Amino acid sequence: LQAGSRITLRDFRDDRNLAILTIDDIYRPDKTKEAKLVFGGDPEHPAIVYLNNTVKEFYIGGKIEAVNKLNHYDYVALRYTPAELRVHFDKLGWS
Amino acid sequence: PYEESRKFARDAVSQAGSFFLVHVATPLEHCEQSDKRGIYAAARRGEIKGFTGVDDPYETPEKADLVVDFSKQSVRSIVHEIILVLESQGFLERQ
């Protein structure tokens, strides 16, 4: 992976190809400044714990093109996309 | 049109239960301009004597429970505003 590369983003649940991302950059962030500037600074904070134990070392920036919408098998009639919800507020005649 | 009649109505109903006055304050211009029955028309060319707003008066309500305007709100939300009033006072609770 390097700038200008095109990677496919895959769903670990059903292996489906979801989106194609086009790499702008590939930078190594200061996990300490994030920890502190975004989520306060406490090492016990859930986000921070994630930041250090789960988040890998590099951030890969880039615009996305869509291949497939995620599949969900729970509550599909209650899940909404901004577009669908908007159409719904309309159908209901809400403002 | 007359506050006297309205207060009479409110006093009689109040003997038996709650009375709510909703003033549909839609402006005369709007009303007249959307009249598809040409009634305001016939009033204007004098075929109908003493028509409220053209001849007869309309005593504006001073202390109504709710004031709405079909010029600025839609039927659906006017209805929603009335419903919210009935709800705050316990009328829509479960029996």
XYZ file of C-alpha atoms in Angstrom, chain A residues 92-93 95, chain B residues 74 76-77:
6
model
C -45.247 10.701 7.642
C -45.627 14.370 6.753
C -41.353 18.763 9.515
C -49.913 22.464 7.947
C -50.915 17.750 10.068
C -48.877 19.739 12.517
